[PDB]
Amino acid sequence: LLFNKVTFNGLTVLPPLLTDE
Amino acid sequence: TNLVKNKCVNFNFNGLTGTGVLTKSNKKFLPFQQFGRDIVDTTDAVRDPQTLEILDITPCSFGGVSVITPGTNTSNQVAVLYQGVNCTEVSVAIHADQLTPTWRVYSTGSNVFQTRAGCLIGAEYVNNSYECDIPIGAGVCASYQ
Amino acid sequence: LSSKFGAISSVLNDILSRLDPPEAEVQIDRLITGRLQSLQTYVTQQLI
Amino acid sequence: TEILPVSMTKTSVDCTMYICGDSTECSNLLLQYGSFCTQLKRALTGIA
Amino acid sequence: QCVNLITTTQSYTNSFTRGVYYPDKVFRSSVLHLTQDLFLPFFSNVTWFHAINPVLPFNDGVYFASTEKSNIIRGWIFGTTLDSKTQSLLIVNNATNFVIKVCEFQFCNDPFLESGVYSSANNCTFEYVSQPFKNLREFVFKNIDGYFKIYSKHTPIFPQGFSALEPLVDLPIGINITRFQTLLALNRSGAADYYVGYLQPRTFLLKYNENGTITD
Amino acid sequence: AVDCALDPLSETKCTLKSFTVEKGIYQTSNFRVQPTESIVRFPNVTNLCPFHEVFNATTFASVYAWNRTRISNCVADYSVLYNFAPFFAFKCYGVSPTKLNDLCFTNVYADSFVIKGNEVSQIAPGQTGNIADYNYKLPDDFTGC
């Protein structure tokens, strides 16, 4: 429920080290 | 000049200049409006001044380049992480000379792995889990074993 | 990026194609100063 | 229930494509502004 | 040749949200765009003319709306003065196409629609013909940066709806327009009702749908 | 010395400004796929100027009663004028005939007249002659060809 409730010219978004799993 | 799609090219649509990949779009434009913009006011779709076909403008692939090294005291072997790109695009940009970094890592086979952080070239992916030594991203880490 | 910080344009390609390289230099300098101030403000707010 | 933020989005900036975007004259002019690009990149890496 | 008379009804449009047109040729999908341009203020005092003709100022944009009187209100005149000393516009419509020509026409006192509007033909500069396509006919005229823009949209059944006006022609005439006049097209030997609204510099929040149409 | 564009190890040594690199991951630079081709697209050229009808006319007017034609709202394609006899004599002033096909103009006027062979050199700004003073004269600030 918590996961369902929380919903480009040189700007890169880095993924976190630890995944959600 | 003839139209080229699915390829990073410099386009000029009736004075609108830029660079990007042209693809077939599902956007239903109106007859009077020619080009489209997103919320950040960047051109993301245009129409062909001759064919009247709506073409999506996708910016050419870019991202950070990260080098994974065990340290000079250990070895000179390094791995390169192309952040935020599929390995297929990197392979295409290496086969044809289109990638900005002039240096190219030798793809010996089974050494090009696709992670959620980007394409990893120079390291082999094993199924055994170990403690994280060099953090790459998205749960993947590198080590010198 | 769409803002012209005291310049005739902000596309960075119309400036080099319309006016002379001498004046294009100061126009690009104004745009660079504006965008660098924007980046500095963004990085400071991100640090906070 | 108690909700507390732990982390935020990790962001990286090219510092060159943003200000210039494949412009050589703009890059040559930005090279004269010092190591502001390096400071911004270091701060973003530290935040990440 | 005085053949008609009009009445000025200044108080009207108590509920009015019709003065909306596409400001540019940019496609937007599900985007709330903030636009600063020459729009028609909502709930403004639009002058209602009930004719059974006079010169009206342009003052940087004008809105025009007509009733279901087909082939009646089919003419428009533009120019800083109604004489041959200065260039003037001339627009006519036959419910299928638009014919636009700009020349130094010598307009009469009350043109009624052709020799019925002008008496001479001086050195013209430009001429154009548009492409072919109860009802409502809305029009907006602009003279910004020399380009004469015209927006139009036809819809059946006046204040009980919302519709954006799409651009039709972008005539690059470059003439100075200060005054305008309409043509009632009187029968050769009425109930012609038309609204006139003036545009003002205001900021509007446009709502685009998935298909790129202004919804609100 | 270290050649910073040789290999990723040299690039991370360049970024760290050290010949000995520690174990880890280092952001060195950014990759970008370069544009392969250059596309320029414009609508179909259909509004041809009436110069074709002017040059292909049967008989021109006299030199003292020359008729001026107004050219506006059309694409000035000067390359189609070569279909006539190759005896054209080009003498421009203030503008180049090669770069003329890339510029824009507000209004264009074409004056046509028939003269003898000796009066051809008299059609120029600053000349003096019978036709140049009583039949047709060009201004000092004339722009065209």
| HEC per residue, chain D | CCCCCCCCCEEEECCCCCCCCCCHHHHHHHHHHCCHHHHHHHHHHHHC
**Cβ–Cβ < 8 Å for F35, B4:** no
- Tokens (6 digits) for C45: 């707010």
Residue A20 in contact with partner chain B when CB distance is under 8 A = no
Enumerate residues 6+ apart whose C-beta is below 8 A from E140: E19, E21, E40, E61, E62, E63, E64, E149, E150, E151, E152, E165, E199
**A-contacting chains (≥3 CB pairs under 8 Å):** B, D
Task: Please report the number of interchain residue pairs, chain B to chain D, with beta-carbon separation below 8 angstroms.
Answer: 6
SS3 E177: coil
Dihedral Cα B86, B89, B90, B94, nearest 10 deg:
170
Considering CB atoms only, which of B1, B61, B133 is closest to F41?
Answer: B1
Considering CB atoms only, which of D12, D14, D22 is closest to B19?
Answer: D22
- Tokens (6 digits) for B104: 């190219």
The Cβ of residue E92 has, within 10 Å, a number of other Cβ atoms equal to 18
SS3 E89: strand
Residue D25 in contact with partner chain B when CB distance is under 8 A = no
**Cβ–Cβ < 8 Å for F93, F125:** yes
SS3 B74: coil
Opening angle at CA F142, ends F136 and F145, nearest 5: 85
Q: At what angle do helices C21-47 and D36-47 cross, to 10 degrees?
A: 30
Q: How far apart are CA C31 and CA D2, in angstroms?
A: 46
What are the DSSP E strand ranges found in B16-70? 16-24, 35-37, 43-47, 54-58, 62-69
Nearest chain C residue (CA) to B19: C13
Residue E208's DSSP bridge partners are E214
Asked if F touches E (at least 3 Cβ pairs < 8 angstroms), the answer reads yes
**F-contacting chains (≥3 CB pairs under 8 Å):** B, D, E
Q: How far apart are CA C12 and CA B140, in angstroms?
A: 39
User: Which secondary structure element, helix H or strand E, spans residue C24, and what is its range?
Assistant: helix C21-47
Q: How far apart are CA C18 and CA E88, in angstroms?
A: 34
CB-CB neighbors (< 8 A) of F73 in chain E: 126, 128, 172
Contact C13 B41 (CB under 8 A): no
CB-CB neighbors (< 8 A) of D48 in chain B: none
Q: How far apart are CA B134 and CA B141, in angstroms?
A: 5
SS3 B44: strand
What is the residue whose two structure tokens read 């009469």? E108
Say which experimental method was used.
Answer: cryo-EM
Asked if A touches E (at least 3 Cβ pairs < 8 angstroms), the answer reads no
Residue E4's DSSP bridge partners are none
What does this entry list as its resolution, in Å?
2.3
Q: How far apart are CA E102 and CA E84, in angstroms?
A: 11
Contact D47 C16 (CB under 8 A): no
Burial class (CB in 10 A: 0-12, 13-18, 19+), E47: middle
AA identity, residue A4: N
**Cβ–Cβ < 8 Å for E16, E48:** no
Contact A16 D7 (CB under 8 A): yes
Nearest residue to F28 via CA among E110, B79, B53, B44? B79
**Cβ–Cβ < 8 Å for E175, E87:** yes
CB-CB neighbors (< 8 A) of F70 in chain E: 125
Nearest residue to D45 via CA among B122, C46, F8? C46
First to last CA, chain B: 54
Asked if F touches C (at least 3 Cβ pairs < 8 angstroms), the answer reads no
Give the residue from A6, A9, A18, A19 with the most D CB atoms within 10 Å of its CB, the best one to mutate: A9
* Residue B140 to chain A, least CA–CA distance (Å): 8
CB-CB neighbors (< 8 A) of D9 in chain A: 13
